[PDB]
Design a protein around this nucleic acid. Structure first.
Lengths: 109, 97, 94, 78, 94, 109, 78, 98
DNA sequence: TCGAGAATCCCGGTGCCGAGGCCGCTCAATTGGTCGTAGACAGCTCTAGCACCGCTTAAACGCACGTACGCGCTGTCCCCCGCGTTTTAACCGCCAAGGGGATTACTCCCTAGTCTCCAGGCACGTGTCAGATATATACATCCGA
DNA sequence: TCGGATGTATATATCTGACACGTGCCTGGAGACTAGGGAGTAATCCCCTTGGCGGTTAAAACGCGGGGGACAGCGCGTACGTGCGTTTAAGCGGTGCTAGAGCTGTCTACGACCAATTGAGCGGCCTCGGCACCGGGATTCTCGA
């Protein structure tokens, strides 16, 4: 008799998939062999970054009285943080726009 | 007559256009320009619909960034108008020339 | 007809934990997919270069940790390292 | 066809950039710069298209060409 | 004691063909070694990415040629392509 | 009776090594398999670029009454060209210096 | 207080190689801060490489890799 | 009466002198002390190879020379011949380091 | 437009240390077979890219006026450059100790490769509610008297 | 300071299409097993990094004088902003045709792997000439009367 199956994500306590990450690592020509904890580590890091971005974007969307999230909200969340703007400083987000900014010398007297 | 002073409508337009997210160039002329430029590298070429959209988005973002740098150069020269020399200095420092 | 795969299920599952009453559009979902793929490629490439430098033939959690320390700035790196260590410890404990 | 990029369009781009007064000689310079940028991207896109032995240029090709020059674009696959 | 390898002999052979009476110093030879290694790595990476995009598993002279076209500017690319094609033809002749 | 050995470089009519390049490609985790003509093509390109740079550097060395080539000569050759300067635009050469250049506004009347 | 070892004459020599004819008196303090930031950024990555390799000595290869990671390739040291 | 050159002459003479040589322009021992002082904040009891400090010094000198080359262009654009902290700040902002 | 002074260039001679060639030798590249899969070619199906025609209207174009900003010219003062004198520490040569980088054996635990079996995730269809759009205020901001 | 005029934020009503969710199915991930070598640890050797001491002298630091460049102020004129009336072409909708992308099935040549065999490229010596330095004189650039 074979025991009931149990996904690796469930025993790692995660929501991102470990098996798919393992497969992508193996078929990506990154090394000859892949260890057993590397997919778990990579999945946890990816999940944490996704959670941070989503929290900021949801706050931005709720600020302007909306229920859904759009690229404008994502861009505002990314550009108003200091570390995320450093991590994604060479990235263009389609349908995102720009931040409001006018130089002080141009305003009327 | 109810003429506004010079510079009021310009600031109003700045406020209006830094709040929206739409494209600002006409799609048919941009598509024609893309095809005309492409025809020099290969003949009888076909384009997917989303390729032209990607090209337009990248072009608009690049131009907006360049104008942002040009404005800082012009202010550094104790002015409020932008000139071709400002664009040239910005590009030279950015390393494109 | 071949079928494609993405991270939409997992992104939705994560979002329902931090904001139980919010939705998302297709454009935003595509942007999130691009973000995940790009960060994956960056980290994997850095780990591969480390393994080549030290004359090893295996990619391990030590390599992933060093790549994260090299790529992420400031407090993001600290929190990511803590999350990864906790996940690996829990996985081993079972 | 470069004349199809109009003075009002260039003015809108400048307003989104945040400028207040524009000189009369800006427009020709802008057109030249845009042409150079487009040529540089499209050359690599067509090289990718030719390698796969196709007659159609795709969004994947455009995204790869943008990424090769440090101008990564989100929102069109990848 | 381990022994290492470099491109000094081949660089010297090339130099004696274009300037039959000029020598070279050790610092300049190191600079040439760095140059050759850098160009090699660039071209190999570009070919690997091309082969991955087209869902293949082999690296060929076509991939090398396309990588050269993408990496080198202007007349350099044309001359390099001609040199490579002539070399491959001569090798396949025998 | 095994026939006399003959190097692949000799069959290709080249001075750079082909077997070593083949081994380096095989052990660099670039792809699963490597074709037969790729090392030949790559070695030809590398030899061409080396020959170009060396010709220019030797001209620079002879210009200032020297027999040997030095990093200063390499820097002068690289910077005075247009295409090599573009190919090597983000590179620092040790003990090279700079190109002589003075702005016209700074010169005396 | 080792940042004071970079002196005003040395900063002037660097400027002269850069092509500068007249220098104001407040440049030196700014140049010192710029250099400190650049050095911190490179040395942190070099130490990270050493720590992964499990050594107690910083080598030239660590510095070369750290510089290359920041788009500052260097020739002539390995 | 003693002989004196006008202001600016010896400056151009030095520009020509230093644009022709290739030697280093900072003192070895103070630079080494500064590197060792900076390194302490990340790890204790570290050792350095001889060539590592040379590589660091080479990179630093090249960086500063490029920065001054851009600052001079800013200063000339402002219709001046004297460089300033605001010129350095503008050059860095456009380059994207700030 | 010319003389005096300071700086840079040219040249002959000495001396030394680094480039350049030679020898042993060992390890990596060459040759000869065998085998199994990756890729090349033909045939077929159907998506989607291109071309056309009418119309409605929002944007582009062109002209006229005037105001405010760019740019030249003057004058003042203070700060930075050139030079002589005193002080400090960088640099070179040589001794001495030992911390740690590098290499060689030995052994074992971890990862790759197979095979069977099942549930997670994808393609597809369906209904309703969030957001877009029109109209009517109500209110804030600018401008000249 | 204030009234007149214009632009913008806010509220309410009504439609519509995209998102959120079931449902069937199929292929890719998990459970169980075997085998072989990558790496972890202990021991030893010798190199290169760090610390000290003294002498010479070149670079750094300090003070003084003066000239020219930075900066504020005023005036003149023309180039760009704003608004109105006429013209042009983009956007939308709907028809219709076929070029080419995408998938599937056969088959064969080429790249991987393994076992002998030998010569090319690396490490270790020597040795002589290209270049570094010194001293002397010649020519050039700058500055003031």
């Amino acid at each position: 008799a074979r025991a009931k199956a149990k996904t690796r994500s469930s025993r790692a306590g995660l929501q991102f998939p470990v098996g798919r990450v393992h497969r992508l690592l193996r078929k990506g020509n990154y090394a000859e062999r892949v260890g057993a904890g590397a997919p778990v580590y990579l999945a946890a890091v990816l999940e944490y970054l996704t959670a941070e971005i989503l929290e900021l974007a949801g706050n931005a969307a709720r600020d302007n009285k909306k229920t859904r999230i759009i690229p404008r909200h994502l861009q505002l969340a990314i550009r108003n943080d200091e570390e995320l703007n450093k991590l994604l400083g060479k990235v263009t987000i389609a349908q995102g726009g720009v931040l409001p900014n006018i130089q002080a010398v141009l305003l009327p007297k | 007559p109810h003429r506004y002073r010079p510079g009021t409508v310009a600031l109003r337009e700045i406020r209006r256009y830094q709040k929206s997210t739409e494209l600002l160039i006409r799609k048919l002329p941009f598509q024609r320009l893309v095809r005309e430029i492409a025809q020099d590298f290969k003949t009888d070429l076909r384009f997917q619909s989303s390729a032209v959209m990607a090209l337009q988005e990248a072009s608009e973002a690049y131009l907006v960034g360049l104008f942002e740098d040009t404005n800082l150069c012009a202010i550094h020269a104790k002015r409020v108008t932008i000139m071709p020399k400002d664009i040239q200095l910005a590009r030279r420092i950015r390393g494109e020339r | 007809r071949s079928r494609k795969e993405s991270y939409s299920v997992y992104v939705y599952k994560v979002l329902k934990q931090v904001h139980p009453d919010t939705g998302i559009s297709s454009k935003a979902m595509g942007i999130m997919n691009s973000f995940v793929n790009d960060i994956f490629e960056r980290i994997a490439g850095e780990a591969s270069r480390l393994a080549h430098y030290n004359k090893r033939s295996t990619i391990t959690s030590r390599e992933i940790q060093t790549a994260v320390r090299l790529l992420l700035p400031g407090e993001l790196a600290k929190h990511a390292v803590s999350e990864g260590t906790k996940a690996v410890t829990k996985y081993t404990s079972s | 066809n470069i004349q199809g990029i109009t003075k009002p369009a260039i003015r809108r781009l400048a307003r989104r950039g945040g400028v207040k007064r524009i000189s009369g000689l800006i427009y020709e310079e802008t057109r030249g710069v845009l042409k150079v940028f487009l040529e540089n991207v499209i050359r690599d896109a067509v090289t990718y298209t030719e390698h796969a032995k196709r007659k159609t240029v795709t969004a994947m090709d455009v995204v790869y060409a943008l990424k090769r020059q440090g101008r990564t674009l989100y929102g069109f696959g990848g």
